[PDB]
């Protein structure tokens, strides 16, 4: 019942402010025809009410996927996103959120060969958004497994501290691939949330109510 006290200007607050304002800037509000004043203010507030919370949703998915992606790069830990059902459940949930928003715009029930083709490529967003995250989190990890297996195979057979140039090269390649995994982790969380914004923002368009009567001049 007692909330904690927060310091203004904290680094998590600043980072999260920048992240939220980045994801909010993905789907900006449309500039109305009229000059925005107290006459147009309830129409602007209503237009914000019709818009989905894509800033909050994209910030949620970005934080929850960059955390699970950077979990795989911590020692003794694995990424939850490297599991299939987790990452693909996030992707199918984003596609279902965009679909449910678009169905709520059109009246809650679902709409020659063009209709099957575009429906297949739309339904493939459900697979694609989660699977492109899951196999990317499986990517550097399974390559890392096999490569550190051979990196173990060299000094297990040539001696513990002998032939250091060959194992030096293989460990340099291993270090470069864990750094690439860091880049791919941050970048896959970013790509997921960029795509969530462009998928949900397809159905984020409602018409401005505006003034139905004015006093001109």
């Amino acid at each position: 019942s007692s909330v904690r006290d927060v310091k203004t200007g904290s680094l998590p607050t600043n980072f999260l402010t920048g992240v939220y304002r980045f994801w909010r800037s993905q789907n900006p509000a449309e500039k109305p025809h009229d000059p925005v004043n107290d006459r147009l203010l309830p129409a602007v507030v209503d237009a914000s009410d019709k818009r989905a919370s894509i800033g909050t949703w994209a910030t949620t998915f970005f934080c929850t996927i960059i955390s699970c992606n950077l979990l795989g790069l911590m020692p003794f830990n694995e990424a939850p996103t490297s599991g299939l059902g987790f990452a693909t459940g996030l992707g199918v949930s984003v596609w279902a959120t965009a679909t449910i928003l678009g169905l709520s715009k059109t009246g809650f029930k679902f709409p020659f060969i063009f209709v099957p083709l575009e429906t297949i490529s739309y339904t493939f967003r459900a697979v694609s958004l989660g699977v492109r995250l899951w196999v990317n989190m499986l990517a550097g990890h399974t390559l890392l497994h096999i490569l550190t297996g051979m990196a173990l195979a060299l000094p297990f057979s040539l001696g513990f501290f002998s032939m250091v140039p060959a194992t030096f090269g293989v460990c340099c390649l291993l270090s470069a691939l864990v750094g690439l995994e860091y880049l791919v982790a941050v970048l896959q969380s970013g790509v997921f949330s960029i795509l969530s914004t462009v998928y949900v923002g397809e159905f984020n368009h409602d018409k401005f109510i505006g003034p139905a009567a004015k006093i001109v001049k």
Binding site: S121, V127, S128, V131, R132, I194, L195
Partner: protein, 74 residues
């Protein structure tokens, strides 16, 4: 068995298609660099277009990968 053996062969021939997918993706990112160097005042917008194209072209990649799973575990 002949079936699981041909499943491995068909999986390799299935994931052949990632070559042209990666080639088109590299062409698109090179044109992203060229467009950002030609006119950087819209470069952020261009990056958005690039990522848009990236996701769409990687759909083809997952299409090929789907076929690999349909050969490997289906």
């Amino acid at each position: 068995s002949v079936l699981a053996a041909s499943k491995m062969v068909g999986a390799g021939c299935a994931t052949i298609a990632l070559a042209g997918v990666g080639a088109g993706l590299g062409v698109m990112f090179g044109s992203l660099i060229n467009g950002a160097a030609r006119n950087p005042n819209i470069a952020k917008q261009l990056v958005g277009y690039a990522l848009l194209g990236f996701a769409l072209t990687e759909s083809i990649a997952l299409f090929s990968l789907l076929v690999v799973f349909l050969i490997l575990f289906a």
